Amino acid sequence: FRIFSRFNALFVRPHIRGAIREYQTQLIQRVKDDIESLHDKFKVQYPQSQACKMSHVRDLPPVSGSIIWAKQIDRQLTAYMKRVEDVLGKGWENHVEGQKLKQDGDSFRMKLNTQEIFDDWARKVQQRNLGVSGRIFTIESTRVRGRTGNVLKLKVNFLPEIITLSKEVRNLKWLGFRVPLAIVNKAHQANQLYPFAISLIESVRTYERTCEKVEERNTISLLVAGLKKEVQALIAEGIALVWESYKLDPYVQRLAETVFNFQEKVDDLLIIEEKIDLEVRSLETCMYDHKTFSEILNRVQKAVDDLNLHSYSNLPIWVNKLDMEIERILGVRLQAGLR
Amino acid sequence: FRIFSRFNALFVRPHIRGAIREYQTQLIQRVKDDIESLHDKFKVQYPQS
Amino acid sequence: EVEETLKRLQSQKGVQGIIVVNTEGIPIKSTMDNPTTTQYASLMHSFILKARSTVRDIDPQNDLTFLRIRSKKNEIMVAPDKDYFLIVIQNPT
Amino acid sequence: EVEETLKRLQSQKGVQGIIVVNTEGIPIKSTMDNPTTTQYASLMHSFILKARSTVRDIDPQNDLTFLRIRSKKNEIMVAPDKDYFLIVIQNPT
Amino acid sequence: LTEEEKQQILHSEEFLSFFDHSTRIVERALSEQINIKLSLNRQFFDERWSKHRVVSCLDWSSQYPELLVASYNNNEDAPHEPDGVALVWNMKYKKTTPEYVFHCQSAVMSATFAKFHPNLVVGGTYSGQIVLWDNRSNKRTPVQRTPLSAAAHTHPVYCVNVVGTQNAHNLISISTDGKICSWSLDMLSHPQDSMELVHKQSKAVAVTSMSFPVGDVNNFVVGSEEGSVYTACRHGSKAGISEMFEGHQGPITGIHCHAAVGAVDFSHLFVTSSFDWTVKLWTTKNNKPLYSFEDNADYVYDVMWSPTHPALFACVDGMGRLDLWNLNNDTEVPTASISVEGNPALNRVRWTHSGREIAVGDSEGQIVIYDVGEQIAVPRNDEWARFGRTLAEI
Amino acid sequence: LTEEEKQQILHSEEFLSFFDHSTRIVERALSEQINIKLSLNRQFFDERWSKHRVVSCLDWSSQYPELLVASYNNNEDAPHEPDGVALVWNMKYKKTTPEYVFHCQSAVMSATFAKFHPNLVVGGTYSGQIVLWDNRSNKRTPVQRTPLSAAAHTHPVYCVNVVGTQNAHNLISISTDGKICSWSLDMLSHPQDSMELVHKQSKAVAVTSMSFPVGDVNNFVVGSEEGSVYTACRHGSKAGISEMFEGHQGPITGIHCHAAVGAVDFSHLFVTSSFDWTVKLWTTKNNKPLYSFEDNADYVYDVMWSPTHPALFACVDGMGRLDLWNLNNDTEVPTASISVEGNPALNRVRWTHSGREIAVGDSEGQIVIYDVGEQIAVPRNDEWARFGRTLAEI
């Protein structure tokens, strides 16, 4: 076909047409073999092919991926038939081989229909009745493994897979397939409300993770209590809200920044607390000498002052109990030295 | 100097001659007072040059 | 990390034995046995101290950051900077 | 040929001909400043002999012909055959 | 005899420089100096970090023309193990192990080097959060991460780039939603610019890949999964979509602008690798594609210009073969072709800096790098002239 | 033991194993890898020895390219303060004072480094006596002083230099009277060879400039105060002026032969600097000045070739601007030209022997060290061919 594309000048003159009609049967047989190979490749189903895997990697949902893949296969088949029509000329179907080839192509195209899967997907979407309306976030009861009590794990009233439906609808609109207007409205609402919901869920996950990190080290929870108090107050303010409102964006923004500040203060307190605990443990076994004790105490007080200037929460009792522990350790070292 | 030195043998043409210095005589005046500023150095420098 | 480092340094050539020596000789770690590791690593530490003196003799600010010995029967590797003395036992090839 | 070895060794980067040090600690060949090369040749002989003793402690059948004494300024290629110790000053890059 | 001092100095992790130099020198020590047309050169397949793993992105370090960054999405083999896998690979000496490794809590989609700093590496993930990592430091966690907010990216990001010089740099990223956002390498916690790209009637463009004219900042060119190519001015006199192209019927997967610069200006030539084996080429001044690539069907992924040759590029097919395409000698058949062994689902290719070799990605994680013919790598002024005259053919 | 038996043991034929060992270690050690615009460059301005005291001449040391000799001649602020001071200024380290300070009883106005002695400075003064300065001695007075006899120079002297091989040197010095004389660098008590330059009978030459061609010492070019350049043969039957040149109607304020080598010879070319801003890129073979670059109301004070670039050279100007003319780039505008602050009368320019930096004189004594861009400093292989083509233009 490329060789012919090099030379198409006197095809109007029925002199070179004898040569092309001499090999016309070879052309038809080879094109038939090509379309048979393409159909064999098609017979490998979309989920059974790596095309579905890559499209999932390419953010293309499997339903739309299969639909568009069949569409492009049909487009390539149409390109093949129109190119054969162009190269051979008008009325190749008049030949018995030509009409047989066109019948095979039409049968394959009938087997290559695509709207049925679109209708099935739309029917399934309508039947399941996807929705996000309700509460801003949901609280549930779960008995997590390892603990006898019923943990009231906090979740977000938002299905992560709804955006997949929204992107499916977005793809289908330019694909020429029309979905019911209710589905259009639902997908549009989910798409526009997605950033707020994902921000909410990431913020709540981060706050949870850091609060379990805090309670992992019980020596820090008393200091961190105030920040947890404001976080709980913000959660209490936000939970009463219905899923959709006009104050959603400012509330999500302030909650996210509050959670980020809470987490960063948590990690700063954690590192300074491990530092001070390490210094205390070193002083526990420190050799009997007024000097080294004095520098250790000076560094301890410097860390305490660094915490104080940061304007953290609930310091004085923490300082008092640190003094209690350090005076007990001092008494132990003093009895050792005295004996 | 060099910008019309690009022309040199160009304004010998009947139209190139008419396209040159008939639109730039004001710039001939400008180069003249440039020369005025040039001899401004000459004006008062003799023993303090 | 410790175990991952030893595993990746060993599996790169199927090295017969490597231990991490972050102290000045006399390591308690072992890779095939205590003696052949510890005494040979201490001897390596002494010899690399001598080599550091040798390289400081020409100019004191010089330090030996890389050292390898490839003889007819064994290959020995060590990359000391301040206390990180490496040991590698390997075929000459 | 001696001259062939000279021209082959000087082709290497940062190498001025070829200089060889004997067991007495002096270079049999003269290529650079005599006192510095003689003192550092005594030093290489000292620590290569101690390395020979070190390896013979556990490997009494090995022979030494390769050593990579590299610093942040240069690499030194010291290679003894039996008596003629081959030494090459080479840039690390 | 110490029993705890060595134990505690091993427990204490002051091995940053230690491990750094050990890794940089032991692979060098792997050298065996014991005294007693297309052609594959080096095949890389990390068993630990690429076992049944699809390469998500590929890039070449301009500052260090020996370093590569490889990206991976979440691993279906095991969700518990780290999902976002980022790989750094080097050619200083042959070695199976990668030079560096990196992990992101979300699936990594795109990643690239930084032009502003020769060590920092930036990567786009599936959560739409750009990820910063420092190569010099030995850490696995992301160094910096942009906040997940409405102003910032929220949909998965598939193309991140740094524009400008090393003193007027600007990190530009595009989300699949259509948000364009500019950051700086110093701070990655706030978008310096943010604006949701729109073509018309306030509908956004689902951008898949983006490209920019070589040697030019602003006036960006984007590709959409919708099957259309768009020219979008970054700031100009008006931000947003500046041109609607006819495009290709299938989705546009790989879009790239011409990069070779010589005696003629060919920076306006655009090549787009669509889903239908069709690499469509044209110029920004023409609304129609100038030529079409047709030898098979079903997804040639991406098209990448050769930095040195003006009329030569590469494009890898999902079927499992890489065909080298040159315009000066041919316009209907590939000038060179080769298929990776096993016929794997070859994903993506990336032209190295200064050319002379190509890097190929794969769905199995076994990336292959190899050179090209010396008779075909080097261009000449004749190549530029004949490319110019072949562009005038139609 | 001693260095005699080593010779026989080397001649002894047990060296096959040694040669095999050497070959093996060399072949194994062959592989080597890695482990991991015009600008004001610097300043030089004394205060005790440079209060006014205009700069007269400068030079760079061939053996020590980091060393520059300055010469300040006029003394008018105070009769009691030193008349002629010679200052040497170093490049390796930045100091507010010259590395060494030298005084002459008269006004030192021409100075140069010594090639044979790497620790000696020789200079010419207004009285006409050749002034020595051995840096080994701690005394500021001149070490050796030539007599003020008719045999030696008795008029002001401007061109002093040492040339020839390391084992054959001659201290060529010429005064305003037109007399040439050579000296041994170790003995200057008597003129070893001297004769006055004179053209056609009863016509003396008011010498003010000279420059030996690169390599040649037997013949050279002399710049006269009467604006007429001449070529003279240092030694031979035709020792004396050999060329009448029209030159320019202004006195010559500097001269220099070509200072580049590596491609087709250009040493026959030379640069002359007149008193009316008329520099003449021009060869000794021709009698007509090849070009007559003209601009400005002021005029040059010196012109120096590039030691590495066969086309670039520097120019002086009276209102404080220094310009570079790269002939291959252009012949009508200076390639680079900037003005130093205070618009002072620059008097001396001396290219560094490396050619990567250029020094300039001053009307107040503040020596300004200027660095140039890399693209403008280093020439290319095609630079010589382009220079030849430009010369062939007219």
UniProtKB/Swiss-Prot annotation, chain A:
Effect of I3L: In SMALED1; disrupts dynein complex stability and function
Region (Interaction with DYNC1LI2): 70-221
Subcellular location: Cytoplasm, Cytoskeleton
Position of the signal peptide: none
Impact reported for R17C: In CMT2O and SMALED1; slight increased BICD2-binding
Domain of life: Eukaryota
TM helices/strands, residue ranges: none
Membership in a protein family: Belongs to the dynein heavy chain family.
Subunit annotation: Homodimer. The cytoplasmic dynein 1 complex consists of two catalytic heavy chains (HCs) and a number of non-catalytic subunits presented by intermediate chains (ICs), light intermediate chains (LICs) and light chains (LCs); the composition seems to vary in respect to the IC, LIC and LC composition. The heavy chain homodimer serves as a scaffold for the probable homodimeric assembly of the respective non-catalytic subunits. The ICs and LICs bind directly to the HC dimer and dynein LCs assemble on the IC dimer. Interacts with DYNC1LI1; DYNC1LI1 and DYNC1LI2 bind mutually exclusive to DYNC1H1.
Function of the protein: Cytoplasmic dynein 1 acts as a motor for the intracellular retrograde motility of vesicles and organelles along microtubules. Dynein has ATPase activity; the force-producing power stroke is thought to occur on release of ADP. Plays a role in mitotic spindle assembly and metaphase plate congression.
Domain remark text: Dynein heavy chains probably consist of an N-terminal stem (which binds cargo and interacts with other dynein components), and the head or motor domain. The motor contains six tandemly-linked AAA domains in the head, which form a ring. A stalk-like structure (formed by two of the coiled coil domains) protrudes between AAA 4 and AAA 5 and terminates in a microtubule-binding site. A seventh domain may also contribute to this ring; it is not clear whether the N-terminus or the C-terminus forms this extra domain.
Record-given protein name: Cytoplasmic dynein 1 heavy chain 1
Organism of origin: Homo sapiens
Gene name in the database record: DYNC1H1
Curated annotation (Swiss-Prot), chains C, D:
InterPro entries: DYNLRB1/2, Roadblock/LAMTOR2_dom
Organism of derivation: Homo sapiens (Human)
Gene of this entry: DYNLRB1
Entry's family note: Belongs to the GAMAD family.
Keywords, alphabetical: Acetylation, Cytoplasm, Cytoskeleton, Dynein, Microtubule, Motor protein, Transport
Tissue-specific expression: High expression in heart, liver, brain and pancreas; moderate in placenta, skeletal muscle and kidney; low in lung, prostate, testis, small intestine and colon. Isoform 1 expression is up-regulated in 64% hepatocellular carcinoma (HCC) patients.
Main location class: cytoplasm
GO cellular component: centrosome; ciliary tip; cilium; cytoplasm; cytoplasmic dynein complex; dynein complex; membrane; microtubule
UniProt-recorded name of the protein: Dynein light chain roadblock-type 1
Function recorded in the entry: Acts as one of several non-catalytic accessory components of the cytoplasmic dynein 1 complex that are thought to be involved in linking dynein to cargos and to adapter proteins that regulate dynein function. Cytoplasmic dynein 1 acts as a motor for the intracellular retrograde motility of vesicles and organelles along microtubules.
Keyword Chaperone found: no
Record-level GO BP terms: microtubule-based movement; visual behavior
SUBUNIT field: Homodimer. The cytoplasmic dynein 1 complex consists of two catalytic heavy chains (HCs) and a number of non-catalytic subunits presented by intermediate chains (ICs), light intermediate chains (LICs) and light chains (LCs); the composition seems to vary in respect to the IC, LIC and LC composition. The heavy chain homodimer serves as a scaffold for the probable homodimeric assembly of the respective non-catalytic subunits. The ICs and LICs bind directly to the HC dimer and the LCs assemble on the IC dimer. Interacts with DYNLRB2. Interacts with DYNC1I1 and DYNC1I2.
GO molecular function: dynein intermediate chain binding; identical protein binding; microtubule motor activity
Intracellular or extracellular location(s): Cytoplasm, Cytoskeleton
UniProtKB/Swiss-Prot annotation, chains E, F:
Keywords assigned by UniProt, alphabetized: Acetylation, Cytoplasm, Cytoskeleton, Disease variant, Dynein, Host-virus interaction, Intellectual disability, Microtubule, Motor protein, Phosphoprotein, Repeat, Transport, WD repeat
Post-translational modifications reported in the UniProt record: Pyrophosphorylation by 5-diphosphoinositol pentakisphosphate (5-IP7) promotes interaction with DCTN1. Serine pyrophosphorylation is achieved by Mg(2+)-dependent, but enzyme independent transfer of a beta-phosphate from a inositol pyrophosphate to a pre-phosphorylated serine residue.
GO biological process: microtubule-based movement; transport along microtubule
One Gene Ontology term, aspect cellular component: dynein complex
Family: Belongs to the dynein intermediate chain family.
Role played: Acts as one of several non-catalytic accessory components of the cytoplasmic dynein 1 complex that are thought to be involved in linking dynein to cargos and to adapter proteins that regulate dynein function. Cytoplasmic dynein 1 acts as a motor for the intracellular retrograde motility of vesicles and organelles along microtubules. The intermediate chains mediate the binding of dynein to dynactin via its 150 kDa component (p150-glued) DCTN1. Involved in membrane-transport, such as Golgi apparatus, late endosomes and lysosomes.
Disease tied to this entry: Neurodevelopmental disorder with microcephaly and structural brain anomalies: An autosomal recessive neurodevelopmental disorder characterized by global developmental delay, severe intellectual disability, microcephaly, dysmorphic facial features, and cerebral malformations including simplification of cerebral gyration, agenesis of the corpus callosum, and brainstem and white matter hypoplasia.
Protein name, UniProt field: Cytoplasmic dynein 1 intermediate chain 2
Complete-protein stretch covered: 208 to 621 of 638
